[PDB]
Design a protein around this ligand. Structure first.
Ligand SMILES: O=C(Oc1c(Br)cc(Br)cc1CNC(=O)c1ccccc1[N+](=O)[O-])c1ccccc1Cl
Ligand SMILES: O=C(Oc1c(Br)cc(Br)cc1CNC(=O)c1ccccc1[N+](=O)[O-])c1ccccc1Cl
Lengths: 163, 168
């Protein structure tokens, strides 16, 4: 569980519980983003978490949903995409990487979310590490737990967002 | 990552037979007995014509289709509503018809286990059902809890690769 996320009422308590679950697991920053069936309106997604506010604003401002390589990945797969240097291919994606890094978001992964009612989302989690090798060792050590977490977060958060 | 290397063979297969053999072995190696992987394309409710993989007794699968059990199987309705597992507990069989279903499934050797709902990136709807042989439900539940995180990863790997084989 999942216990607290269900007993919670309102976005504020739900966000605090999810953030703490991630933090306890070893991830300092998280974003839970969700769209309803047949929506591509990323700039109006249901968004939860503790990403820096200025970064979230810039992301929307710059239209980074069209650039961020994890977005297109999420439309095609249920498997995680790790924030590996190989995913940033274009010059725009290089800038995206640099800008996200400035915001403190360099190491992490994005778990695509695909709900029972056609919801489309992502749970992104970032880790503080001394290098990418350290980050990857940590992420591998907690991956099975994260994999369960993302589905619990999806089932709970879909109803909060749209119902 | 070494953790997920096992799951990579699911994309390295050529054809439904090899894919089925790989999936069945991963499940068997993990400690489960019988499995059924079922998948439908976007918008489909045609359970009698799903893409199905596994080692459920053939006569049972034939019976399930014939008797229209998809209409009453509580794991089916659950999968339309949720991404979370549904464990095969007496409490999920509520209607008299679902009691019949449970009795018939038990005769086919399917009593303890769980169903992982599958929801694909392209609207695919499915289930990965796995049965457990045990002396009682408590032992069965103890085993299932011990392998659940591995199974949770497996079901998504199976879905991603399975969808390509079924529809792409
Ligand atoms: O929430 C979604 O996308 C978003 C939205 Br909107 C806003 C923001 Br800010 C961030 C994301 C997802 N991207 C990341 O978190 C990320 C991934 C790799 C490197 C760096 C970052 N980062 O720092 O942002 C989303 C993605 C796919 C499908 C649906 C949604 Cl709603
Ligand atoms: O494959 C799907 O449904 C099916 C289809 Br067809 C055929 C068969 Br035989 C079995 C199922 C799923 N049911 C089970 O495996 C099950 C669950 C609990 C107790 C006993 C059993 N059982 O032994 O049958 C399915 C389910 C949800 C969404 C899509 C699909 Cl294709």
């Amino acid at each position: 569980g999942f216990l607290e996320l269900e007993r919670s009422s309102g976005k504020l308590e739900w966000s605090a519980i999810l953030q703490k679950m991630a933090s306890d697991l070893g991830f300092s920053k998280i974003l839970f983003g969700l769209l309803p069936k047949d929506s591509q309106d990323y700039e109006n997604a249901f968004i939860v978490g503790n990403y820096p506010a200025a970064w979230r604003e810039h992301y929307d401002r710059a239209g980074y949903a069209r650039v961020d390589p994890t977005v297109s990945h999420c439309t095609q797969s249920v498997l995680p995409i790790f924030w590996e240097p190989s995913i940033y291919q274009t010059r725009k994606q290089h800038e995206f990487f640099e800008e996200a890094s400035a915001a403190g978001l360099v190491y992490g992964l994005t778990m695509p979310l695909h709900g029972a009612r056609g919801e489309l989302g992502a749970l992104s989690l970032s880790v503080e590490a001394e290098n990418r090798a350290e980050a990857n060792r940590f992420m591998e050590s907690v991956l099975p737990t994260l994999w369960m977490l993302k589905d619990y977060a999806l089932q709970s958060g879909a109803g909060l967002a749209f119902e």
